[PDB]
Design a binder for this molecule. Structure first.
Ligand SMILES: CCOCCOCCOCCO
Ligand code: NA
Length: 55
């Protein structure tokens, strides 16, 4: 169950619209390769594994 969203740099968060059409925010990791490095970069959310990867 995979989603693409957009991340924000200040809050280091991923915003994705879930299957119900509801916008949901979830934290990006602190790790270098998974943090949001720029506003409006892509991010992915795997709700099966509950894993977030921001760019
Ligand atoms: C606001 C939530 O704070 C949780 C702090 O716990 C530290 C654990 O590190 C994060 C592991 O994914
Ligand atoms: Na990334």
């Amino acid at each position: 169950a995979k989603y693409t969203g957009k991340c924000t740099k200040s809050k280091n968060e991923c915003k994705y619209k879930n299957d119900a059409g509801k916008d949901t925010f979830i934290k990006c990791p602190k790790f270098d390769n998974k943090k949001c490095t720029k506003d409006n970069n892509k991010c992915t959310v795997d709700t099966y594994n509950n894993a977030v990867d921001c760019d």
